């Protein structure tokens, strides 16, 4: 008897592995924006980061979930409508977008995904994007890794006098996951 | 875990005595037992005293049989380590360690601590 | 429609759910896998690894070189162990820092035995007989050789063999062997002692190390995924 | 993880000669297979296919260690060495032979870690590789490390103890004199640069101290033999000259 | 006949087994600091209890359902948009969370639910968790119990001008029971 | 997707739904069951089991050990019975704290047969006579022995049998017989008689005890889980 | 809940011989299984499965009743004790006979509980075991009643008229003089520590008063006799000494 021991069990947990955070200003607030960009990486976690750096190489459906949370910001009686964001994955190395307008943003060959507030987190599957047979958690020869895209939010409706806050949670579920040669783990800190 | 900290360490005379101590954490020092190790400076661990916890029996070195004394109390949580007739040989780095029991054996021992150093001999 | 009825639990994300979700690239072509030597199938299996215990921990030792050294230093014929050690895999600063250790630091529970095994490193030329010793738990360290040679236990001949294993059973109460840190878990006693006195050919240096490895077996298993993280 | 006891001293001598090339090794048997895979094809093939002898490096008292990289360490061996850099691809297999000789009278133990993508010390893991292509790539006389690999962290960040979960032999002067390991080609990819990735990493640490008696050699010699098995490059490029 | 008298039908009933007290408010309220933690007992109730208690030993699979129910506190006009709530099981014996910051709140291996208010009450299944063949209603030897871990909720949309109070209503459904030894019931007050 | 339509009771917890929910912990190796004796199927079998009934709960016999004694005084032939208990299972103080009762205090009905028991706990050498009586529900309670004779009972001696079962039929107008407090539920009448006068051999203490069990019969069941707790 | 009505005085003498021991029961028949449950396995096997006398303890006018432990009572027995104390684990069956003679003179009623868990008064249950491991365990002794466990309250929360749904027998002195009961091992745990927890609770309490005639013996006698049945502890542990 050992299930809850496999590779995949061993994985099968949702762990948070950032926490974007966007808004929707009536003026300039160009810091967010309205948008925020993230370089999707398990490495800015620790508690995925260590339990995936047992091993040094691995393939790995990856199952993303988000998390939108919304709240005022200021000590105002100001409404607002319920908010639609727009998730962004950009596939590895694409044009990387920067102001909330640009034309990345009508990407014909990136996904893209519109989340209406107030109902189930959002969810997407992207399958093994290697570029190599398996992802090298750590490398040798001659950091970037391996890259598994951008995340790129946005709020999509217009400029609301009574500024709203959000943060947009990402959630990285390894499915399907296989690995090869184990290191021993990391003792310290990284 | 349990991290005891090293008390009454310092600078005496040839001929004089010493007492040290050790408070408890992480467990109640009556499990495991406690004792001390003077690493002379430039050489290896060198085992002095040994004291059980529970089941009291003293065990020494040869090198300082008779002349030091080592007491228990696991009400305080605290070890005692009484050195006496003291000599300049006696100079080295202390240290207390809680092991399995009350054997004087380079380790045998868990959890040590920094290191207290009694200088007996520091007039000339 | 088909009349339908949302129950509770709708609309909640659990994190340990088993959902399929709309794959956000359709067609794409993944690279197929190769056959790359050392898959992993469970974790079970990395602690089945023959691993090196850092036995001396002390002070100046600890973090360094010399922690996975067991100096055959030259003391009394006082049976005071060379060398004793808590089966609490968790709950014993040594055996937690083993593969075997860093697997067992993520579960509540552990069944099964485990074997040590010591390889000696000595002076061919040198000769003598240790006694490794277990003591099922509950009971005081055994003090005197006397006392471990009661135990389960093998008489390890240096001149003989380099290197001795010795498996300790899986002597429990309960199904699953707590992996906590309890009070005072029982837990083995593995402990080599100075059957005789180290016998030394000409002029060798005198002094010698052991090292030892630990492993679990194929009956030894996990449950109740626990963690932590800084 | 290394437990047994073929006999001791030794038994009879039977010589690998491949091409060229002729060791006479101790015995030939306790040899580890790296992960239980033997090396295997996806041109000088016999002609390349043979053991060179790296530089003979000494270990004494003080040692730290010793390590090298493969392909790199026979980037200058004849048929292997050309065929590799007039290749923009390459895979190959190793049988790695550790040679290391005393007598009756030394005593110590020593680890031949096999660690395939050892990246070596730079916890820069906001990015590896780091030390310049020349410093990482020291060829056949090998690389050391210290009290830049720190040989307790196995010169990575993790503690040596559990640097047995990559295959390895221990070489124990009471024992074994020599240590075998055929290593397959590990990557993440079919075939790859030979040139700027390096598939594995000999790792040679004292995991016993050497001690001699009274007065003997002051200290002892260890050598390292490395044979390709399996060799393929693609595509018969450039000759130039 | 006698189905609806059968030890699966005497408990197949929801009963309430606490009520968690938390908030989100714009300062100082460290006392609920949006969080509670409370510690899985059926030993806080009565009903459920005495129910569990005409028997020794029992096996019983674990299904809870939460309600939860918002409110202002402060006579005020103020706004909030509909709030996310976060309730964890934390497996038998596992880091207990204080602050509603800390780590352990990333819980690489416990199980988390989020939930998003106004929609179906939310509901999870806890198989047999006993380190034991049963579970002890009364021990003897040399209180804990057996211990079935814990929950923790707070707000997890970020501090909102207008205080919100909440309450977390759990209910325990033992499901697929069986039970050992008789004892006489317990007459009088707990 | 496929045409659906949410109907009325959507989003609503029926605490007495049976509904399939995501399971926390998935592929959690639970601890197999072990057959420890004493499993109990349904609540009808505790009811089943004989139990001591406080027949004596008189102000300072109540609450106390003597609450179970039925003390065989020495009064006159006095047809005036010595015991009587109104079979109202819940709806009469004393029939309500047995087991057959505690059962019986949550649910709304209940049917099938009774069985009053008693052992009788004199000095051996003594005898008599005695008389168990039961009277169908409505009747008064008989009062004299002639009355009590007329009705459903058995003529226990105390010489020859110790013990004595006395069956109360399941007589009764509708299918489920009211297990709340009625007015005045009907409800049998066990009640025994001093058919003769103790006879009581040389020296002893002349005062002896008998003491009473009930339980319910295999075609005793119970409907409309009903409850209370404070 | 045990109305049975064997003959009433005596009728044959059958005594029951378990290795060196002897005892000579009253006869033999009306013996009850706990749950129809007969003591199973899962070593001193037949020299250890042998039943032991315990200390005889008087029953007069104003007695309370008495309690014991199991397998605590047993402690200081021969075999029985020794493998239980050199042991971690063990489980254990028992035969309980509880013998209690008087004449056709003498009158009242004994009831013999076996308690599975029987913990003892405490009513904290918000920490049950309580007492010191000395005092909740009284050994061979035997602990008492009183009117620390209270008799009604069957000392434990519960109203005395309810113990009939453990398993029991009444020693009723006009019917029989013995009581038997076949206890198998009950325990949330296939196997567990034996020194540390109890796993039954012996009760026997006055449910009827003693009565003798005008005078004769002021008090009578009520003896027990336990036998350990199928007893497997693990594993040969230390034999200190």
């Known amino acids: 008897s050992r299930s809850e021991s496999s590779i995949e069990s061993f994985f099968a947990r949702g762990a948070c592995v950032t926490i974007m955070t966007v808004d929707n200003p009536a003026s300039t607030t160009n810091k967010d924006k309205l948008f925020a960009v993230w370089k999707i990486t398990y490495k800015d976690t620790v508690q995925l980061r260590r339990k995936l750096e047992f091993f040094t190489y691995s393939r790995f459906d990856m199952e993303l979930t988000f998390v939108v949370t919304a709240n005022f910001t200021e000590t105002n009686n100001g409404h607002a409508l319920n908010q639609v964001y727009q998730i962004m994955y950009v596939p590895p190395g694409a044009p990387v977008p920067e102001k909330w307008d640009d034309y990345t943003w009508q990407t014909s060959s990136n996904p893209s995904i519109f989340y209406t507030y107030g109902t189930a987190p959002a969810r997407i599957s992207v399958p093994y994007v290697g570029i190599s047979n398996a992802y090298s958690h750590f490398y040798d020869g001659f950091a970037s890794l391996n890259d598994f895209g951008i995340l790129a939010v946005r709020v999509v409706n217009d400029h609301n006098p009574t500024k709203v806050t959000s943060k947009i949670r990402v959630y990285l579920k390894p499915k399907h996951i296989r690995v090869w040669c184990p290191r021993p783990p990391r003792a310290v800190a990284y | 875990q349990v991290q005891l900290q090293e008390s009454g360490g310092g600078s005496v005379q040839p001929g004089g005595s010493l007492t040290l101590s050790c408070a408890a954490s992480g467990y109640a020092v009556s499990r495991y037992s406690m004792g001390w190790f003077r690493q002379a400076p430039g050489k290896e661990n060198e085992g002095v005293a040994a004291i059980d916890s529970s089941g009291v029996g003293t065990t020494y070195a040869d090198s300082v049989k008779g002349r030091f004394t080592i007491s228990r109390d696991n009400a305080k949580d605290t070890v005692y380590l009484r050195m006496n007739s003291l000599k300049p040989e006696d100079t080295a780095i202390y240290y207390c360690?809680?092991?399995?029991?009350?054997?004087?054996?380079?380790?045998?021992?868990?959890?040590w601590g920094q290191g207290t150093q009694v200088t007996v001999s520091s007039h000339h | 429609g088909l009349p339908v009825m949302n129950t509770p639990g709708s609309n909640q994300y659990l994190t340990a759910d088993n959902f399929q979700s709309p794959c956000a690239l359709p067609e794409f072509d993944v690279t197929p896998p190769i056959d790359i030597p050392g898959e992993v199938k469970n974790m079970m299996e990395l602690a089945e690894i023959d691993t090196m215990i850092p036995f001396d921990l002390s002070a100046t030792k600890k973090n360094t070189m010399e922690m996975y050294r067991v100096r055959l230093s030259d003391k009394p014929h006082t049976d005071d162990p060379i060398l004793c050690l808590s089966l609490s895999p968790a709950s014993d600063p040594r055996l937690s820092h083993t593969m075997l250790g860093e697997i067992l630091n993520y579960y509540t529970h552990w069944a099964g035995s485990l074997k040590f095994t010591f390889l000696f490193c000595g002076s061919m030329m040198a000769t003598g007989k240790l006694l490794v010793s277990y003591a099922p738990p509950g009971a005081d360290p055994p003090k005197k050789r006397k006392e471990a040679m009661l135990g389960t236990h093998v008489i390890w001949d240096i001149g003989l063999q380099s290197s001795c294993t010795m498996v300790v059973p899986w002597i429990s109460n309960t199904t699953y062997r707590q992996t906590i840190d309890d009070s005072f878990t029982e837990g083995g006693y593995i402990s080599v002692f100075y059957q005789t006195r180290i016998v030394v050919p000409l002029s060798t240096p005198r002094e010698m190390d052991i090292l030892g490895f630990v492993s679990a077996c194929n009956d030894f298993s996990v449950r109740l995924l626990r963690d932590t993280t800084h | 993880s290394p437990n047994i006891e073929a006999c001791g001293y030794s038994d009879r001598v039977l010589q690998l000669t491949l091409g060229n090339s002729t060791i006479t090794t101790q015995e030939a048997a306790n040899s580890v297979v790296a992960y239980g895979r033997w090396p295997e094809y996806l041109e000088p093939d016999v002609a390349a296919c043979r053991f060179y002898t790296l530089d003979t490096v000494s270990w004494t008292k003080e040692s730290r260690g010793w390590w090298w990289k493969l392909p790199d360490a026979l980037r200058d061996m004849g048929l292997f060495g050309q065929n590799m850099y007039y290749h923009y691809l390459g895979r190959s297999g190793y049988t790695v032979h550790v040679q290391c000789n005393a007598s009756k009278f030394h005593q110590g133990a020593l680890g031949v870690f096999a660690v395939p993508e050892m990246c070596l010390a730079g916890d820069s893991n906001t990015t590896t590789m780091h030390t310049s292509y020349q410093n990482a790539n020291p060829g056949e006389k090998g690389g050391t490390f210290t009290g830049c690999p720190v040989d307790y962290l196995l010169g990575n960040g993790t503690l040596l103890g559990n640097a047995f979960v990559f295959p390895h032999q221990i070489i124990n002067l009471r024992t074994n004199n020599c240590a075998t390991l055929v290593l397959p080609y590990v990557n993440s990819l079919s075939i790859d640069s030979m040139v700027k990735h390096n598939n594995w990493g000999i790792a040679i640490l004292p995991l016993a101290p050497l001690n001699f008696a009274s007065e003997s050699s002051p200290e002892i010699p260890i050598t390292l033999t490395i044979a390709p098995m399996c060799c393929e490059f693609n595509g018969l490029r450039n000759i130039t000259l | 006949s006698r189905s609806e008298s059968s030890i699966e039908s005497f408990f197949a009933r929801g009963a309430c087994v606490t009520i968690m007290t938390v908030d989100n408010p714009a300062s100082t309220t460290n006392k609920d600091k949006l969080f509670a933690v409370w510690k899985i007992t059926y030993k806080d109730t009565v009903q459920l209890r005495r129910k569990l208690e005409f028997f020794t030993y029992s096996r019983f699979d674990m299904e809870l359902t939460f309600v939860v129910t918002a409110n202002f506190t402060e006579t005020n006009n103020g706004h909030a948009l509909n709030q996310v709530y976060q309730i964890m099981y934390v497996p038998p014996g596992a880091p207990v969370p204080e602050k509603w910051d800390d780590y352990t709140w990333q819980t690489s291996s416990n199980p988390s639910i989020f939930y998003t208010y106004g929609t179906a009450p939310a509901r999870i299944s806890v198989p047999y968790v006993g380190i034991s063949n049963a579970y002890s209603h009364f021990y003897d030897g040399f209180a804990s119990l057996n211990d079935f871990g814990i929950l923790a909720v707070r707000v997890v949309n970020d501090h909102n001008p207008t205080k919100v109070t909440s309450k977390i209503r759990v209910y325990l459904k033992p499901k697929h029971i069986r039970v050992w030894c008789p004892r006489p019931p317990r007459a009088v007050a707990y | 997707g496929l045409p659906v339509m949410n109907t009325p009771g959507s989003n609503q917890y029926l605490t007495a739904d049976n509904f399939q929910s995501p399971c926390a912990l998935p592929e959690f190796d639970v601890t197999p069951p072990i057959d420890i004796p004493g499993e109990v199927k349904n609540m009808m079998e505790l009811a089943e089991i004989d139990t001591m009934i406080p027949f004596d709960l008189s102000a300072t016999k109540k609450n106390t050990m003597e609450m179970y004694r039925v003390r065989l005084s020495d009064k006159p032939h006095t047809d005036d019975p010595i015991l009587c208990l109104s079979l109202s299972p819940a709806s009469d103080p004393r029939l309500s704290h047995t087991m057959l009762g505690e059962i019986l205090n949550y649910y709304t009905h209940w049917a099938g047969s009774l069985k009053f028991t008693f052992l009788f706990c004199g000095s051996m050498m003594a005898t008599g006579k005695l008389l168990v009586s039961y009277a169908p529900p409505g009747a008064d309670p008989p009062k004299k022995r002639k009355e009590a004779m007329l009705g459903t009972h058995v003529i226990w001696d105390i010489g020859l049998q110790s013990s004595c079962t006395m069956v109360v039929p399941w007589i009764s107008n509708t299918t489920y017989r009211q297990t709340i407090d009625d007015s005045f539920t009907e409800g049998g009448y066990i009640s025994v008689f001093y058919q003769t006068r103790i006879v009581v051999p040389l020296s002893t203490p002349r005062e002896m005890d008998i003491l009473g069990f009930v339980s319910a019969c295999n075609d005793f069941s119970v409907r409309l889980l009903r409850d209370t707790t404070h | 809940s045990p109305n049975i009505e064997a003959c009433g005085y005596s009728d044959r003498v059958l005594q029951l011989t378990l290795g060196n021991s002897t005892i000579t029961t009253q006869e033999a028949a009306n013996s009850v299984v706990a749950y129809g449950r007969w003591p199973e396995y899962l070593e001193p096997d037949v020299a250890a499965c042998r039943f032991y006398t315990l200390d005889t303890v008087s029953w007069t006018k104003e007695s309370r009743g008495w309690w014991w432990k199991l397998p605590d009572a047993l402690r200081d027995m021969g075999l029985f004790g020794q493998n239980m104390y050199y042991h971690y684990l063990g489980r254990s069956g028992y035969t309980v006979h509880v013998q209690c003679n008087a004449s056709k003179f003498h009158q009242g009623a004994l009831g013999v509980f076996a308690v599975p868990e029987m913990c003892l008064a405490g009513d904290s249950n918000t920490t049950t075991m309580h007492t010191s491991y000395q005092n909740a365990n009284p050994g061979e002794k035997g602990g008492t009643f009183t009117g620390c466990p209270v008799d009604y309250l069957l000392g434990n929360g519960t109203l005395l008229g309810n113990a009939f749904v453990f398993p029991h027998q009444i020693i009723n002195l006009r019917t029989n003089n013995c009581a038997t009961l076949v206890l198998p091992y009950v325990n949330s745990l296939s196997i567990d520590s034996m020194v540390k927890h109890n796993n039954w609770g012996i009760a026997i309490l006055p449910l009827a008063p003693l009565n003798f005639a005008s005078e004769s013996s002021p008090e009578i006698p009520i003896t027990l006799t336990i036998a350990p049945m199928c007893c497997e502890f693990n594993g040969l542990r230390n034999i200190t000494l």
């Open positions: 360690a809680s092991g399995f029991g009350l054997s004087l054996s380079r380790y045998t021992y868990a959890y």
